[model samples]
Target chain A: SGFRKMAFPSGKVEGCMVQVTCGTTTLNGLWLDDTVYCPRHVICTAEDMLNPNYEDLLIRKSNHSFLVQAGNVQLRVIGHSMQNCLLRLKVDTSNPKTPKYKFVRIQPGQTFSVLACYNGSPSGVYQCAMRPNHTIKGSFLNGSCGSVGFNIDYDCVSFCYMHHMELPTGVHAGTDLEGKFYGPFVDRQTAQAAGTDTTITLNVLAWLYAAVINGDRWFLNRFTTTLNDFNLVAMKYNYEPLTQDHVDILGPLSAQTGIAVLDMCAALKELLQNGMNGRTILGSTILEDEFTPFDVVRQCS
Target chain B: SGFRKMAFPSGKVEGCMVQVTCGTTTLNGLWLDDTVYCPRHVICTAEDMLNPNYEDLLIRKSNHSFLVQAGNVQLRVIGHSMQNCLLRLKVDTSNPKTPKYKFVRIQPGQTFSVLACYNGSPSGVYQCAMRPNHTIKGSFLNGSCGSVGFNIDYDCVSFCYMHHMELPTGVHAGTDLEGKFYGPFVDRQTAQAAGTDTTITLNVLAWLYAAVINGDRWFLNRFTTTLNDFNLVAMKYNYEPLTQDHVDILGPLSAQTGIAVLDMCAALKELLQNGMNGRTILGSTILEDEFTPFDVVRQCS
Candidate 1:
């Protein structure tokens, strides 16, 4: 040990694992960001986000620590941090004519009425936010695959397992495509809760499945025309929004959320096929799908 | 006499600019890359990309040489190096509920259309590619204070400008507004030519001037939630796509082509009124009414 002030390791430990940083370190680039991991935690906890939401659990181990919104039919995690969450609706204005009426979505905490179907004018001052499920998807309940085992699972209520669909060479079973499985609702309460009148979760399990790249339409329009511009390249390439957390992990949902939403949907479809084979738009155009941070809940329900 | 076999008289002569290096030096934390331009002679050429767009223009007297899509509505410089473009519409699939349905425009080549509201089957196999138009601001005609004195102008026969609109500090000048100015169409055969009843361009000038900002529900969701998302941050912050040349030089639709876009629309309305205090989505949601590289065509009678 030449010179005493030299650093000798394997001992001088505990900076909390030396603050490693680890994976997901975009700062604010790739996709979804605000709520950085729960600040006042989306206004003291969802529902109104300007802020409220709590109460109704057995009541407190500090009432399950963080996130709330319960009966609204989404976003839970508090103390044991059960995780998994979604449901968001934000709007003040936008609808030049059907992007479902120019980018609009307001109704996370029940204001009720006025969607004569985007005939325009329902009344505003809108805001709603939520985000917990960091990853581990579950979708295609309606649009592409359905029935046999439906959709919506979040790693089977955080208990996890029973799902996979990779099959080019490996991974296949949520039971090789069935018609049912259902819940763990553990009752946050709903169409009936526990005694069960409704509330099913993960489309009973993976409804008729069928997602082996829909029998290739040139691999289905070369990967949905490159995921149909994934919300126009996350807001033309910077405003960053279109976040269904990469469709909550594709195909019976990434066989239970692992290939990391297939590398964030092939890094937003090879960054817009490298901006249509030339990637370079410096003058400006990137703010992505309406400030989509907090992993953009973006209308999952 | 030749003992001094060396040296530099007048800094060692000849190089054109002699070893300019010119561009390419990003570095990024790890992977991914695809586009690079410099040819026509930035120092060399385009493709393989690191970076390099323009120094100014003037030269190329040897010949223009580049792009053509003509009747498809603008981008025909092919001979005398016009260099500066965009128009993509590609397909070959990929989606969960949806993100990429049908779109990929790079056209600076040809072939063409289907128009049926992306019913998902407009019969496949499509292609077009083009590259040019680095910066110039041609916003279907917004700020640069229209042809004479404009801050506002509207609907015109697919060609050039002459308008205005001001309200206090308001530059209110496009000519204080009227039947409104039109055509930055720098003459694609004015009053109707290039042989036809119609082939007018600039998406035919703002297609229906219907941008009332959602008819104003608070300037209408403050600035239509800040112009909807500017192409979701030009492809989630990298694939870059929004380019009105700078709205076409900030106004008169380019007073010959190069003003400023009135500070890029007052710097995106002061960067979203500081992310709208109590109203925020900070992660994204701003691709604002989209792909708006501007081409209003409006409803020219």
Candidate 2:
């Protein structure tokens, strides 16, 4: 008789909803029996995807530095892959005229370094961006992607990133600045929650996105145009939008075949139009007219 | 010679303290071994005194209805001997001002009887004084008589009687008003052992007296007085001064009696007519400022 054959089951691996860990802490990316996930859809399991216990990866970038002697300087960027990705970096400088530096594709993973040439004014903002490549994934829930931006000045420092959704416009931290953000957090939990028609989770995401956009415009508008005349439209158009809808359909095509959307340029045009219209709206007299029924006027008699 | 005179001892009568019982109860009074005069100086034996218990007397007195009223009302004064004695009774009227009639008296033989009286404040205070007609053998102790006093008010219905040489000053009983009138029960051994100074016995008597007077004053001032102004006085008077020549005889006496010589009313009147200056010595200055220099003037810087 021939030797009897033995059958064995193949090992199965499951993905975690989310995984989180402190600095240098080990995390498992693959889901195991009885694993818990955060409401944000992060999963933690026993086996890491990157390492044996690899979960979500955290990268600590170097703190950017800058020095300004004098300047109205400009540099040209090059490369295909870099052209499509959003660039962001924090600049620590004294120059108000050059508050930030941003660029598109020059070379894949290529480093662009610069030094001041002129000495008319000695203060400026220096920053840089790292375009996403095959090494890191950027897609997250709610259309969020890992595109971090930073800015440094002689007196202040700031960091911002693209958010997955629309946010209420307001003082993001202390009070409602523009009153754009509203949510269940205020209505269900506090007095502010009263007018909130949406859940706080969604509202918070929206606010986050708006804040990123707002912060970027606040910094970049001054960069492209005269500091006094630079407006919101200029800032919005100065940077690329990192929306998930754009990423899901457009990211892979661009990644595999190299196609880029000129979101920054488009956004800049829209902003300029809105600003011009806003001036016209403010000057209009439709707001000053008063109209009451004739019968009410007769009642005064 | 055969029949000589026969000598025989004579039988004699011996007297022992005897117990006197009236009806079903034993009566309390001075007891003697012999039926002789009830002398004040006589020392009564304890064994004989025990034969007649004090409870029997109290029980006998309880059965008698005394002249007591609900308010400030008086009962008829049957005789002076019943003065200062307490007659407790229940009154029917609810109003405190109206008088209700009831009267009784405890007799000499530890007995009591109800008395009838017409209106006009049926109460009277009587003192037991010596009868002039009775011969005095110098055997009775001074002040060996009794007196009774009565008072009725909205708060208290009270009466008091003094029946012994010691004077009943603190023997009292009342719920609303606290006052006592006590004394007169002599501890024979203690009395006999006491010397001429009799300070202990005198102090005991004074304490009882003070309790009665002061306790009554305290209650009256608290409940009866409208403004509640009350005072107690302690004073000493001197009649004459001693000279060095008569130091031996007058010194001790002056110290003990607080007087050196006696002054007749005529001399007193003469002194008054002359308008002689005298000093008004004050008692303790603990709670007063009278006669103190500090009270009279202010110091100049």
Candidate 3:
């Protein structure tokens, strides 16, 4: 939902960018209605979400900016004056699995469209960014464009034919900003299939996530905050003991979910396989590129 | 054609080491003679190709060393004490096509032997080595123990399943100071096929050869100083005229042989096609462990 009010500034019709922080932890930011006071794709409290016109403004953005119509699946976009552009689409589902994405090439200013299907629930929240960057007429993004690749969750770029890692897809396309849990496409089937490599991948993603989230709420199950709370509390006292009976649950969950639940369980299987085989966890386009400890430390360690 | 001599020198009985280099061009080096005056199977002189024992030394090195008994085609190798070693083979053919190579893996200390065959002429020679170090127990040899891989080339191993490029096969091999003029595999059919990429590859190899041969006299028709004279003069004073009859004869001869006439043509074709896509020129060991431009000098540029 989105809305806007003509709270025009005194001096000019322009609005300044405002960084929104949740308590001390910065969750996300917003612009206080720039251009009809519109906040581009990311969520924001910078512009009042509760204003009477807020809902209407969000409704308009859904139509104009993302072209996300009433249903999530019917998403098809040909941005305003977006000429000769290559587009990338990211789908953040409410399950604990890795996200899904699609890449496309389009004619400059030509009407563009693509069909994708996904089921959603009211309690199961899903948020996404399409063609996050308004310019970029190339076929690659993220790791393909070089450097750290598209691993940063909040990065939200629309596309990369091949990001170093496949799941997180792009720095902007991750399930969570700064990717608190998992790398690439982590899912149940992949977790079970890892044989042994799973442990290393899980441990790595977990370590990286903790570096981002002081702790919880990310995964295919991201929409369910209460469960994330339960999981988090259980983790806080893992060897500390929440209570005698608490051991009953956290004890088993410790082995079943392992360390950082979301990250431990969601790393992409293919990336894990590549890592075990001595390839860097992030894929490379350097041709003769060799192994690095998959962005050791956290970023480029 | 082979022979042997039993003359032993014993001031200290230390076998003198040799480094094999071909006509001023340095190829991969060899760490000759590391045994107790117990010379391994390979040609030796101080080492002169014409010293008194020169002829017999080569003949003897061919057999007891690599155990390459007779027919080149009937090759069968099973290295002595070569446990779990990998193998690499190179076949420099008389044909102006790329040389062939094969990499294989097997038990290190087993009779580390396998069969290898590629046609070479008396002048278009083929000399190889085979041993678990049983042949050249000193240094220059084949068959090194490694897990499944194409590392046997620089591996200087006794074996490998195939090459980083395809088309050659090896088994505990021969000893030469250094193999110059050819790098990778080269061929004529492959060259003509290159269409354009060949020019770059041809130019690079030619430059390298000239760096080695201040004057030419090492290829099969190596001593056609007159031909090289014509070629160099033609390059230096192109359009200055070689006279009608001279131009007429050189033209067809150029087409008949194609390139430096040593391994140059073959090198160009292999590098040419290998660059076309990945795989390889002759296309072997898809794991051909690839990279081009790094394949040399930025042509994928």
Candidate 4:
């Protein structure tokens, strides 16, 4: 595990203004420790800062100033009062699919290591990366304030998987973010059945892990990187290989296990039925933690 | 009843290019005599051309040329071969609610005088106005090609109403265009019930008619305008007055009746349950054909 110390400057203070530029769009909010509170319940969490993939992208420009450069996505912090830090976001176009920027937002109190249960057994942790500048404050996040509740725009707040960890829990599914709904729910046979969409199988997870790592091959040797350092690798896996239709649904994941059982639904259902398996060599190595399997999925020429 | 011959010049020829600009967005398509065919099944139908409300807005510049002006919405035609045309559209922002342009497109082969029935009785024709630059050619429109079936973006291909006609059939519902699903189907109590979302009632229709006429008052004395002349009035009714949650559904309306049995659904349903009514004086006169009831609904101050 490459768990390194804080090399980046901790210039961000509580209640300061944080401005994030993803492409041409800008997201403004109040700084909260390692987080940015944006309007419409969007927040830039602490985990997003710790990921080593952003080591080169995040730079300290000066005192109380910093820059996060991830391709076309950028974030700049400045000094400002808390009240002036009203949450606000803007996009050149409101179409969620063709976003002006890319950033990641973790559900409040949720972790990069998502928990799940499969077939009445614990399905260990599956590492996930969230799309950029997307997050919300559900009613569960707080109570004193009126419910902003759910938004149709939040439909694109999806996640992609790089690989998995065999914790006390179960396995992973072979899938990446396809700009649709992705939550951990049970299968049709379980009490948590209604929430199921994509089925959780080791083969699919292996396929997804191999495909994601292969996509990263052009950039770095991200295949063997440990979870702690390999956090944001899936951020680039935005609908590249998986052109499947997204399962559109709504809700908070299970409060108990922090995840739910899922089954193959929508476009992913057909993909599984087509018997698409990653390279046998790559697939076998994925369960032990692995990277890009370029043969099965690749960038379109 | 006040149908009139098109007073504008007939300069447009078939297979020409038609460009429609609403606000900042532009829609380009091929002209087929009186219609303009745009991408994604959207078409500017013949019915839109004949409506007299465009008498002042639609102008002819020269040979094989024309223009349609409705406030910020504009459409112009130029002579070009059909092969040079490929259906294309551009919006500054793809959010349907805050459209950059406004125009109308009638369902192909469908009439402005929508046909509906109630309690197994044929309700007369109800006058409807389509939103700007919005139309689609379903698989039913033709079969020489492939099936585009449905699109996630087509959710906004909805309609609005102005008044009703006492056809050899039945009556009308009292609701203007709420930007959700509005189609002809059976009541929950009828065999044609699966499609039922909004219930068709004279009271709702009366309220909608009264409200629409009132919104048009500041522009003209449109309350008494006949169906043929009042076609474009509801174009301005987009999500105003009757602020309700749109019932999100999919499909072409009933293929037979061409009209739908609409009860109170979503926002409209709650508006009915709350016992909101138009001016009793105006409501009584609407079934006989009328306009502008300033009291029941008004523009937001």
Report the lDDT tens digits of candidate 2 across residue range A61-91. Answer: 1222111111123211121010111122212
* DockQ for all models: 0.01, 0.00, 0.01, 0.01
**Residue range B179-213, candidate 2, lDDT tens digits:** 12222234122331211111111111112222222
Displacement of the residue A209 alpha carbon in candidate 1, Å? 13
Worst 10 residues of 3 chain B by lDDT: B1-10
A294, model 1: CA deviation in Å? 26
Q: Which lDDT tens digits does candidate 4 get at residues A1-301?
A: 0110000010111012234433323333322233333321112223432332222222322313323222234434443212111222222222222312122433321223222212111111122222121221110101111111110121131222211111111222111222112234211112221221222222233333333332321111212322222223222222112212111111111122122113211212333233223322221221211111111121110
- In terms of docking quality, model 4 is incorrect
Runs of candidate 3 exceeding 4 Å displacement = A1-165, A168-185, A188-301, B1-41, B45-56, B60-301
**Candidate 1 local lDDT, B46-102, one digit each (tens):** 342224233232243222222211112212222232223111111121111121111
Error of 4 at B194 (Å): 9.8
Q: Report the C-alpha lDDT of model 1 over A1-301, residue by residue, as the tens digit.
A: 0000000010001000100011221010000111111111111212332222423221332422322221122233322321222111112222111110011222111111100000011100011111111111121111111101111122111111112111121111121111111232211112322221221111111110111111111111223333345545544533223335334523334453233343444444454445323222211222121112111111111
> Which whole-number lDDT from 0 to 100 does residue B283 have in model 3?
15
Instruction: List candidate 1 stretches off by more than 4 Å.
Output: A1-251, A254-301, B1-212, B216-264, B267-269, B277-284, B287-290, B293-301
How big is the positional error of residue B27 in model 1, measured in Å on the Cα after superposition?
A: 33
lDDT by residue (tens digit), candidate 3, B163-279:
111112221222211111012222111221111111122223323233222222132222232334444433442212223333342232334334333334333233323433422
List the candidates ranked by TM-score, beginning with the highest.
4, 1, 3, 2
Candidate 2: stretches off by over 4 Å = A1-301, B1-47, B50-147, B154-156, B162-301
Candidate 2 docking band: incorrect
